[PDB]
A paper describes a structure:
Full length BsuDnaG was applied for crystallization trials and the structure of the RPD domain was solved. The results showed that proteolysis occurred in the crystallization drops and yielded a fragment of ~49 kDa. The crystals belonged to space group P61 with cell dimensions of a = b = 117.11 Å, c = 48.86 Å. There was one molecule per asymmetric unit. The RNA polymerase domain (RPD, residues 112–435) could be modeled in the electron density map. Superposition of RPD structure of B. subtilis against that of S. aureus, E. coli and A. aeolicus led to r.m.s.d. values of 1.31 Å, 1.80 Å and 1.73 Å, respectively. Clearly, the structure of BsuDnaG RPD shared similar overall structures with its homologs, except for a slight variation in the orientation of the C-terminal helical bundle. Structural comparison revealed that the orientation of loop1 in BsuDnaG RPD was quite different from that in ZBD/RPD of A. aeolicus; it appeared that the deletion of ZBD resulted in loop1 rotated about 25 degrees anti-clockwise. Our results show that the DnaG primase could degrade at the sites in the hinge regions.
Because DNA polymerases are incapable of initiating strand synthesis de novo, RNA primers are made by primase to prime DNA synthesis throughout replication; this priming activity is tightly coupled to the replisome by interactions with other replication partners. The DnaG primase is conserved in all bacteria and consists of three functional domains, an N-terminal zinc binding domain (ZBD), a central RNA polymerase domain (RPD) and a C-terminal helicase binding domain (HBD). Previous study indicated B. subtilis DnaG primase preferentially initiates primer synthesis at 5′-CTA-3′ sequence in template. To better understand the structure and function of primase and address the interactions between DnaG and specific DNA template, we have carried out structural and functional analysis on DnaG protein from B. subtilis (BsuDnaG).
Residue numbers in the entry: 112 to 435
Amino acid sequence: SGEQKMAEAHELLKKFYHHLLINTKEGQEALDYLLSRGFTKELINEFQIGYALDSWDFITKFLVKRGFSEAQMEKAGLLIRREDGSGYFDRFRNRVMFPIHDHHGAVVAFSGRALGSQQPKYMNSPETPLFHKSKLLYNFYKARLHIRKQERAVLFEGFADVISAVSSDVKESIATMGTSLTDDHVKILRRNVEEIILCYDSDKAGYEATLKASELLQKKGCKVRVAMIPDGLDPDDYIKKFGGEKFKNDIIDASVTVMAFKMQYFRKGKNLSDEGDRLAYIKDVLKEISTLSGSLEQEVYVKQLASEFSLSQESLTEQLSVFS
C-alpha cells in the first residue's frame, strides 16, 4: 500500500524529470551536454532520460503538494532526511536522470549523473522496498526479447555502457547497478539464454569482476565469453573512439573463451622474460587448464603454451597431471 505510493511517485517523476530536460531552460545545460556526448533525442526519448533541477526542495515540495508523505518518499529513496531532523530535501539535484525499470517496465529507482562536482558522480537510489540491485538487471525489460532473438546476452556494469551498446545496435545488453553479479541475476539470465558475454572495464577491478562473474555463470551451465577492450579503455570509451559498428563487430562478436581471457589476465604484473615469472604464469595457467572437462579442451590450451614458449608438451603435460 505504501509501496504503491512509492511506485506512483517514480512513474510520475520519470515523466516530469523528462519534461524538465526537454521543455525548460534549466534543462538546456543538461540537454546540450547530453547531445555533445553522443546522445540523440531518439535515445533521450527512448530511455526517457530526464533532469533534476539544481534545487534542494523543488521535488520535495512537488511531491508534498501532490499528497505524498515525505517519510514514504524517503523510504522510496527519492528524498533524504536532514541529519538534524528539521525536514527533507531532494536526493537528486542537478543530475541527468536515468530511470531504472524493473523486469516488467515499472520504474523503481533512478541513477543521476552529476552535472558538476557533487559526489558521487553517479548517484543511485539506495535499497528501497521497490529497488533491490541484487535482483534487477538494468535494461532487462527492454532487452529480454532481443536476448532471445540473438540467443545471447551482453552483460555490462552500470547503465552508461548499456546505453552506448544499444546505440551500437547491441540491444541484448543489460547491466548490474552498483553491485557484482549475484546468484539471483544468474538464475534470471539462465532462464532466458545460454550464452553470456561479459564486457567490463579493462582496469584491474574490471578484470577481477570479469573473473568472478564468469565463475558464477559457468557453475550454472551458462556458456560464457569475454569481450576484451584493448589498451586501457572501458566500453563507452571504445565506442566513442572507434564507433559502435567496430565495437559490435570486433569486440562483442570476437569475444573469447573464459580460458583465453584467464590466459591474458594472468599475464598482468608478470615479466615473462624473467624465468621465475615465466614459470609461475605457465603453472598458473596449467592449474586452470586442469579444471577443464576433457583432454581435447585441455590439449587445445596446452598447445598455445607449448607454442608461445617453445616448451615440449610432454613437460607441460607432466606438470598438468600434478595439479589433477
